[PDB]
Design a protein around this nucleic acid. Structure first.
Ligand SMILES: [Mg+2]
Ligand SMILES: [Mg+2]
Ligand SMILES: [Mg+2]
Ligand SMILES: [Mg+2]
Ligand SMILES: [Mg+2]
Ligand SMILES: [Mg+2]
Ligand SMILES: [Zn+2]
Lengths: 81, 60, 96, 141, 114, 126
RNA sequence: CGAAGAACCUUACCAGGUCUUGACAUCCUUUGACCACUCUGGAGACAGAGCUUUCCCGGGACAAAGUGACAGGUGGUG
RNA sequence: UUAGUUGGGCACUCUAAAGUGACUGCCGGUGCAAGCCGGAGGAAGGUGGGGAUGACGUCAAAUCAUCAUGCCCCUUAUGACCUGGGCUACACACGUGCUACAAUGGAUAGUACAAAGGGUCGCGAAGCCGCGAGGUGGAGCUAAUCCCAUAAAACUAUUCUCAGUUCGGAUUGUAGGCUGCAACUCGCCUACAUGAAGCCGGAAUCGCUAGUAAUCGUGGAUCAGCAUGCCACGGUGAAUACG
């Protein structure tokens, strides 16, 4: 959300990420969510985000908080003609 | 398609934003006038036939 | 101190229905106004004449309303009854 | 058309209408009024007389018409209609008055009518050049 | 003069607009913090006036520092590898904007025919 | 109080004349505060100078609809009407001046497939 | 230009995950309120449970499951 | 009365029903005649202006995707549901338009005059908070009552002084607001900053004969939101037609 009434994050992702404090980051979390923000709580745990055909991994950082998950998982594969 | 789509129109969506208009006669989504609830082409038919009240052909 | 608003799509029906009301209302109580015409609020629906293509060739459909307004100036129960009994040529709308 | 409210001339109203841009008659009319005020300032005399002299100077007589003759296209001269005469005068006036390059439009127009009454300016060069080409091509009359 | 040799003939507002980081309303706010007349000219200034204006400026963010700041912001999303920064790196529109046609101030001038 | 109505485009002037010196009100305002232009003010005068009745009557005006020039045209129209009213022998003068010609130039329709009344798009074969 | 409104829906296309008398109608047989709301596993569809479905006067109207006849195709050819 | 306010009255507008009128009907010229030119009256003169109204048929023009529809094909899939994506891609070409390239202008302030339209869970006032987008609030309204709705161009004053400029407004960064479960892909709008290209357009090519072209704003539909597009509205208002 663009507004102070937010933030937004999918409950089905926030819950799994909160359970993933005891993950130890050996495992990985798949989501079909590209609309959900990144909280700092997502840091460290790689997320496999569904671009349309596959789940592409992203490693969260302090620097990619504030943004969405889809910004790190492109939809349209293009190679300079 | 269009029968399944006309079904899926009428049952309530997951979220209310997913609403959209369709002419009950022929469920085309485009150019459906919510005041009549008809699509433009069916509207033209019935308006010729005089089966719509108060509407006639606009000269000016 | 009571008012009728008649609105429809057909000015001949509407005028004559108003004249009916006014004559009956004068019979049941003498002091009544005449009917007063209001503006014809209307809607011009503009439609593609063709099916597939031809955004440039169209057909236009005007839905007009005609409407008159009446004010009763000395009611009686006779007047109220004459208007409570009376049903008009449909296609119109009476409002009190 | 109709004469000007102030001066007893249709030429003023036509010049206003021919400077006018997108219906801005108020702007055009006001600037022409102020421009006659400027030429009265710097000359002290009849704006109608000086504008008439400028007309009479920018006013062509002969003009070319493009006509197919002998498997090509030629320029044949012809005596211009009396209406197109004034039309071309006012047209040329306004167009040089625009392409001049001074500060303000009333100023440009006023200087051009001065030069024109004095037999100077691009607008008179135009009449001279039209005569020159038509006279060069007067073999074809 | 005031961080860079602004015009001497321009008025003070327009002069301050020619600082990378400052435009007309910031100029009005600054000259109002100074209490000066904004309609005055720039060669017509005074030195103590000018120094107060310099103080308010140096409170406002520095020119070159602003350059460094925006470039750091861009470097960030280039160096993560987001979509938006791939657009920055590829030279294309970043907003949700169309590239089949009308993308000239990003792609550059008209490239060679394919 | 002589009276006339005047219509130009969508402007409607209910205008009336009294005997006076020449003062003029328009919408409870000064004619100069309502129509500041000499051109439009002279346009208003046109009947009163076509027939020499300017220095005789006061023109009292109320107006709605349209723009400033249209309101001016309406006003001169209703004025010429009321001049007829006070004196039918002004008929020839005002008719031959053309002030009784209610300007029937109304603003033309827009039409479909056209970007205005008459304007069409830019044609291209290919 | 169809498109008098492509975020989801629309949307017919693609990837993935799923169903096959079906998302949508008639005819048969059993039954009758069907459902709604909470929990859990879920991207959701959907599965497991609960609470809780009042049909109305043999008929009527709509409904779950069986069952094949059928359905459905923005599949084609203007 | 702060308000056409309140009282009062339909004078006048305005509204909208039934009528009138314009029909070469009359006069002069010419024609044999049809008719043509001029003239008068009148608001309007020559099918007054503008619409809708599109003959037999041509392009086997377009439409099986609005609908129906013959034949053929798939019918535990060419059918059906769900999530996410794409229809918004991007070396490049064309069309249509919007914005401009400025001084008949721009910034700032004050300020006059429109029409045609929409509104019930919809319009949303006044007042207030916020630079602003908007928030709050809930008046009045099922509407000639009330709202959307300051109309903007115009005009008046001051400034900028002809400059890639206070032009232009892209693109980008940060921060906001709305809508909607959700604004990365992929909405709109605001604030600040940045300030791009562009200093009037090759060969060629388009619309327009009058309240038209040009120009300025407004409204409506679709629509939660999303328009330089579409359809209507009025404001200002020309040039020219030899042929
Ligand atoms: Mg919708
Ligand atoms: Mg065919
Ligand atoms: Mg075809
Ligand atoms: Mg064919
Ligand atoms: Mg498309
Ligand atoms: Mg001709
Ligand atoms: Zn239909």
């Amino acid at each position: 959300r663009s507004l102070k009434k937010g933030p937004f994050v999918d409950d089905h992702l926030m819950k799994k990420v909160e359970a993933a404090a005891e993950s130890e980051k050996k495992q990985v979390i798949k989501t079909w969510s590209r609309r959900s923000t990144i909280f700092p709580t997502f840091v460290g745990q790689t997320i496999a985000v569904y671009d349309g055909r596959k789940h592409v991994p992203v490693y969260v950082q302090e620097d990619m908080v504030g943004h969405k998950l889809g910004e790190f998982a492109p939809t349209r594969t293009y190679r300079g003609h | 398609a269009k029968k399944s789509m006309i079904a899926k129109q009428k049952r309530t969506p997951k979220y209310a934003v997913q609403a959209y208009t369709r002419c009950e006669r022929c469920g085309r989504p485009h150019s459906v006038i919510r005041k009549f609830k008809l699509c433009r082409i069916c509207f033209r038919e019935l308006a010729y036939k005089g089966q719509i009240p108060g509407v006639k052909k606009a000269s000016w | 101190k009571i008012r009728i608003r008649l609105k429809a799509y057909d000015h001949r029906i509407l005028d004559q229905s108003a004249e009916k009301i006014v004559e009956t209302a004068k019979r049941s109580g003498a002091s009544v106004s005449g009917p007063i015409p209001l503006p014809t609020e209307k809607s011009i629906y503009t439609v593609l004449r063709a099916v597939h293509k031809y955004k440039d060739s169209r057909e236009q459909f005007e839905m007009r309303t005609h409407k008159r307004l009446i004010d009763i100036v000395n009611p009686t129960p006779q007047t109220v009854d004459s208007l409570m009994r009376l049903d008009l040529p449909s296609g119109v709308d009476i409002e009190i | 058309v109709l004469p000007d409210p102030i001066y007893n001339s249709k030429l003023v109203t036509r010049l206003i209408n021919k400077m006018m841009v997108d219906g801005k008659r108020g702007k055009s009319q006001a600037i022409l009024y102020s421009a006659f005020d400027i030429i009265a300032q710097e000359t002290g005399k009849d704006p109608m007389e000086v504008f008439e002299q400028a007309m009479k100077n920018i006013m062509p007589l002969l003009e070319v018409k493009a006509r197919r003759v002998g498997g090509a296209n030629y320029q044949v001269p012809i005596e211009v209609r009396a209406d197109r005469r004034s039309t071309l005068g006012l047209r040329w006036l306004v167009n040089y008055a625009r392409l001049r390059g001074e500060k303000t439009m009333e100023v440009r127009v006023a200087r051009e009518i001065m030069d024109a009454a004095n037999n100077t300016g691009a607008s008179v060069k135009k009449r001279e050049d039209t005569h020159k080409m038509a006279d060069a091509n007067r073999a074809f009359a | 003069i005031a961080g860079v040799d602004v015009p001497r003939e321009k008025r003070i507002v327009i002069s301050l607009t020619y600082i990378y980081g400052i435009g007309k309303q910031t100029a009005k706010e600054v000259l109002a913090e100074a209490g000066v007349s904004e309609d005055t000219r720039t060669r017509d200034l005074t030195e103590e006036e000018l120094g107060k204006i310099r103080e308010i400026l140096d409170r406002i963010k520095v020119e070159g520092d602003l350059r460094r700041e925006v470039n750091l912001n861009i470097k960030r999303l280039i160096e993560i590898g987001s979509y938006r920064g791939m657009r920055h790196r590829r030279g294309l529109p970043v907003r949700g904007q169309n590239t089949k046609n009308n993308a000239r101030t990003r792609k550059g001038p008209s490239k060679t025919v394919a | 109080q002589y009276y006339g109505t005047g219509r130009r485009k969508s402007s409607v002037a209910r205008v009336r004349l009294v005997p006076g010196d020449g003062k003029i009100v328009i919408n409870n305002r000064d004619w100069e505060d309502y129509i500041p232009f000499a051109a439009l003010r002279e346009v208003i005068k046109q009947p009163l100078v076509a027939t020499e009745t300017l220095g005789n009557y006061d023109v009292l005006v109320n107006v709605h609809g349209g723009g400033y020039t249209g309101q001016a045209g309406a006003i001169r129209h209703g004025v010429a009407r009321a001049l007829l009213q006070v004196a039918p022998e002004y008929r020839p003068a005002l008719k031959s001046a053309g002030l009784l010609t209610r300007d029937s130039r109304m603003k033309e329709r827009k039409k479909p497939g056209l970007k205005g009344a008459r304007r069409a798009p830019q044609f291209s074969k290919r």
